[PDB]
Amino acid sequence: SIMSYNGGAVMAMKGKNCVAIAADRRFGIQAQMVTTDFQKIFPMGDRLYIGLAGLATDVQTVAQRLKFRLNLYELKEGRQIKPYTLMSMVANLLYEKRFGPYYTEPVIAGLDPKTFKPFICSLDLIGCPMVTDDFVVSGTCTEQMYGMCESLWEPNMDPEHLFETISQAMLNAVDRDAVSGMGVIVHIIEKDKITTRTLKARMD
């Protein structure tokens, strides 16, 4: 109930040498839409992104506190954080509030620095990490996203096939959820470039 207060949906998907992360764009309070360009996907590096679903206040708070800790980390160590290290840092941040939890479920998509091996993971609200090799979902329409991703995902997709797969999964999943949608943003992370797209979507 609390996690569904603002709605929202985030999804990450693994390609052959690339990752994709997509989110709905609606910010609303219960049934009422407020805006249609709420940011849920934040960059934590050149090739590392975190998407946050759940309470919008906790989305913003956790993104800002993670940016705090990540900036300190990357100043103390003269290197960029690895996706596994970012996942551990996020889990520690969430578990610090074990009994007063932040109401967000993060999704992490990235490429290994200096290795460029795709990494995706999801965490629950108290920071239990789950690394997969195909896809992770988070938000208020995880059942629909699971149907779409389990049906459509294939191993070793090139970035264009990956974009089509994650786009169709997100679009058809949020078309079937009342409090998500109003546009979809997709990031495709390759080793040499990042592609950001907004999909044509239903606005009802």
Partner: protein, 220 residues
Amino acid sequence: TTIAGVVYKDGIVLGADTRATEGMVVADKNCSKIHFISPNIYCCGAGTAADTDMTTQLISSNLELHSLSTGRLPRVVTANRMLKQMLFRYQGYIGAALVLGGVDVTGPHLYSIYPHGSTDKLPYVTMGSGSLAAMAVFEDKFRPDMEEEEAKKLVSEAIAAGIFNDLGSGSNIDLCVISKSKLDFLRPYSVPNKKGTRFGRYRCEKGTNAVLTEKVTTLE
């Protein structure tokens, strides 16, 4: 979740399923539930997954400090004592249910640890939602001083019973064999379930998705 453990004549066999469900939906098909404590001590976990991971990580860290300080191999009793004191002080709020198995200078030891801080030292234990099916297998077929292969077959059978009769268990069987001379982390040990073969081909083609805006950032 089904986790189990037995004491056989040369050591410990731990086993777990690999399914992690969120509600009634399978979230993780390949979840690792057997946790490193020390090179001679391992722990299967059930209950609140975050609690299990954090508690096992904390105890593993403390035991590493202890073994660096003493220069000796950790004892299973020390891990048991630390875990039970930590869990008792939290009065069951940390929801970690543990099967702790190891081989130390005193031999093989197997403990069940409950979230409120009670422990049982037993020759075979099961835990999780599939624990009663695995326990049924154990009570039907356990014998003391089994050989390593016999113990592995028995634990895999108990995990399989949990997998095929408990809705919260499934996917693969993972084993961890511990003796005084070796540690075998068999992941997966068995794969009794596979995704069904696809009879069709969904339409997934380039150009299928309409795009409003596009932005390409080149990385150096």
